[PDB]
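Backbones bend. To wit:
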Amino acid sequence: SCPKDWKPFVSHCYFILNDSKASWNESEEKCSHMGAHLVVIHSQAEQDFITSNLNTSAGYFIGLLDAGQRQWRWIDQTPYNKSATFWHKGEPNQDWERCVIINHKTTGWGWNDIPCKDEHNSVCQVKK
C-alpha cells in the first residue's frame, strides 16, 4: 500500500513534485528523503501511467543521465534500451546535455535532454 498522496501502478508508487521547481540534484535529494528516487521508465505502460498524471504545460525530471559519451544510465542501475525509450524526434542528438525531462509537445509526450542545472518539476518512484 502506497504512502499518502503517492499513486500506485503495479509494484511501484509515484509522486509528482510540482510544489516548486528544482535542479536535478535538488529534485533527486527531495525524492531520496522520501526513501525514493527520480523515476525510471522501463515500459510503455509506465510512460503512459506517468504522463496521464502530468500537467501538459510543465517538464519533469526523470532518473536518466548521460554517464559518458551519450551512454545513458538509469540511476538505479537497471538496463537502458533504446527500443524502450520515448525521446522526442531529434532528441538527444542536438547537444551534449546530460539530464532528461518528460514534456509535452503539440505532437505529444516524450523526453528531451536538458541542462541538469535547470529548474523543473519531477517525478519520484519507490517500490510498493
Notes: The first helix runs from residue 24 to 33. The chain has one domain: 1-128. Residues 1-128 form a domain with the Mannose-Binding Protein A; Chain A fold (CATH 3.10.100.10).
